[PDB]
Design a protein around this ligand. Structure first.
Ligand code: FMN
Length: 393
């Protein structure tokens, strides 16, 4: 069951096992569950899975004081376009989320909803079935030839969203954030990473707009910062986080090939620190490491060695969550958690190790993960990974 080419290291003696306050939540350790889409939500409805989702989250909440960031969750139908990712717009969805949050809170852990808006990564034929637009920054740059063929075959060509449609998305983020908090979530994370709609605005490849949402660093950051401002004004800065992937190439983003990419992200972080100095500091910034430029590639592939997220620490002075290939690299974690405001997100190995925090504390072998069940409508590879003690039996 265990990864064979990995020699574990106990991290119990590091800042990974020191408490830290994040927003309203007193974490007992700094191992974070990053958002992990599992495609078990039910359709019609985009309902969090009524058989399994509670169990899945409860298992991973088992170490008290754990911050859990939910899978990407759609604020509205128009935000979506994947049938088996959950939403948080409807009473049927909110009923299931409430049970999830209850389960996480019964284990004295924390639940943060990631708010996800797809843009050009949506399936345009699924959107067309539901009478929805296929939305992005650009009126003419497609994510790839496959997306362009699907959009044209469905007569659902990519729509460059207008100012009024941007404002509607901001209102949907706000309402979805309020639904999250009312249902019991500890906070929300705004997904501005991995090539989805807000990242499509930030990135100069995807954004060739000629209005105030494109054509400059400041203009490409506008949508992301309007969402952050609206959600912070609605629910409070202590209940809001942001996720960015400066070096990501997933979903046809530029990454380090774009020489202006660090300036673009530096500007976003500077504007967050400016808000913080005005009394509105976000709970955290969540950065994907250049260790993982594409989460569809195996650990050690799609590594970008040309850049680092260290710049972020000179600009943003709040908590930073870093994710990307850390589970198999405790020697890297031991160095990175020397910084007293650094938390570590563990994605793939939290899929396969519900007791990952115990295993990092004590230096236990890790369960291998089964990539074939990352996105399958199955309990198998979802709620049937064993704890270390179960694995030894
Ligand atoms: C199956 C899977 C689903 C993911 N879903 C999401 C998602 O919903 N939102 C998001 O921001 N990142 C998502 N990611 C990216 C992870 O949060 C993480 O940044 C990435 O897996 C790298 O960390 P790791 O090496 O520890 O797995 C996903 C990754 C995987 C493998």
């Amino acid at each position: 069951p265990f990864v064979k080419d990995f020699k574990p290291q106990a991290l119990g003696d590091t800042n990974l096992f020191k408490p830290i306050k994040i927003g309203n939540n007193e974490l007992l350790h700094r191992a974070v569950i990053p958002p992990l889409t599992r495609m078990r939500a039910q359709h019609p409805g985009n309902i969090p899975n009524r058989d399994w989702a509670v169990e899945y989250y409860a298992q991973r909440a088992q170490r008290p004081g754990t911050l859990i960031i939910t899978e990407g969750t759609f604020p509205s139908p128009q935000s979506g376009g994947y049938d088996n990712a959950p939403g948080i717009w409807s009473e049927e969805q909110i009923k299931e989320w409430t049970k999830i949050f209850k389960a996480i809170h019964e284990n004295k852990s924390f639940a943060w909803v990631q708010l996800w808006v797809l843009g050009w990564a949506a399936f345009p034929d699924t959107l067309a079935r539901d009478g929805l637009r296929y939305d992005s920054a650009s009126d003419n740059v497609y994510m790839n030839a496959e997306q362009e063929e699907k959009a044209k075959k469905a007569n659902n060509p990519q729509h460059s969203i207008t100012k009024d449609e941007i404002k509607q998305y901001v209102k949907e983020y706000v309402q979805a954030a309020k639904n999250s908090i009312a249902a019991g979530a500890d906070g929300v994370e705004i997904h501005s990473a991995n090539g989805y709609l807000l990242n499509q605005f930030l990135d100069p490849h995807s954004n060739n707009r000629t209005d105030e949402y494109g054509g400059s660093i400041e203009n490409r950051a506008r949508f992301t910062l309007e969402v952050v401002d609206a959600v912070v004004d609605a629910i409070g800065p202590e209940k809001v986080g942001l996720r960015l992937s400066p070096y990501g190439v997933f979903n046809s983003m530029s990454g380090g090939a774009e020489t202006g990419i660090v300036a673009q992200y530096a500007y976003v972080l500077g504007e967050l620190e400016r808000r913080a100095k005005a009394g509105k500091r976000l709970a955290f910034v969540h950065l994907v490491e250049p260790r993982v430029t594409n989460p569809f590639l195996t650990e050690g592939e799609g590594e970008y060695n040309g850049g680092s997220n260290k710049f972020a620490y000179s600009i943003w002075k709040g908590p930073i969550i870093r994710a990307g290939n850390f589970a198999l690299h405790p020697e890297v974690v031991r160095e990175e958690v020397k910084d007293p405001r650094t938390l570590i997100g563990y994605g793939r190995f939290f899929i396969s190790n519900p007791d990952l925090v115990d295993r990092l504390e004590k230096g236990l072998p890790l369960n291998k993960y089964d990539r074939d069940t990352f996105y399958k409508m199955s309990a198998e590879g979802y709620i049937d990974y064993p704890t270390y003690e179960e694995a030894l039996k």
